[PDB]
């Protein structure tokens, strides 16, 4: 029932206000995340400076930075295969097909394949030290290549295999959950997680390989922060600002065209977010910005209740609120709540 709700003339006013409020919070969260890295964190030094310096806490060496980088790449490869794809797959295989269909992150917009593929490109970006698919001179890839060309080539191939396997699932993944292609994508993601957390991490950690000193890894950490992390968060800030502006256009003059234009802005803003999921550490994690912007699944019953009662304060939480209160607010806001409000069955919603 909450899944079947339509945007109608009867609820349009409330629907516009829900969209405005969710888009304003996404704008705030992306700005605060970018500022935490680029300007100041916890009222002090910027997180970009703290990470690049690695002078004690939580990173005392360039190796500690790089182990976090690699751990966080392995974590997203694990999340994508075992949970984003795996949770719907295992529900479906057990015979719980209706629960499986609604378990797919980004199904409202039929965007799961592209979303999860961008998560793998986050790994590529972290490993390449770039955003354009070109291997940077100061990348982890180049460091591994100089010591072990075979391991570097196997890692680059494993990243590409996972991205290609997800793209090979027939569009949309929501309608092809039990496919052979789904299983091949899970396999490719598991192989990628393994080569990162086992082979790569162990190889860098071994002092005998001479690639874990600050002289070797400082330029890798600096380039990862300056060319990957900070520009991705800058792009997310800019694109969440544009997404809010597109929601305002739609709310002020609702039309099929304005819904289509706001949906395009949602995909545009999602890209730097999805391409940041290999670095879910530091500010995005500690500030709770990851679940603020990207909780999934949502509390769909609570969304419909908030829409009909215009209880906008239910979307927000404060420092010191208990865990349940924070999660309840996060489960009714963010990119996926805005996605619900903009899309129906993979297409922009229409004005009746
Ligand atoms: Cl989908
Ligand atoms: Mg168009
Ligand atoms: Mg997530």
Residue numbers in the entry: 33 to 384
What does the paper say about this structure?
Here, we report two crystal structures of this novel protein family, a circularly permuted imelysin (with the GxHxxE motif) from Bacteroides ovatus (PIBO) and an imelysin-like protein (with a variant GxxxxE motif) from Psychrobacter arcticus 273-4 (IPPA). The PIBO monomer is a V-shaped, all helical structure consisting of two domains, D1 (residues 33–90 and 244–384) and D2 (residues 91–243), with molecular dimensions of 73 Å×55 Å×42 Å. The functional site of PIBO is likely located at the domain interface and supported by the clustering of conserved residues, including the buried GxHxxE motif. As a result, our structural evidence clearly argues against PIBO being a metallopeptidase.
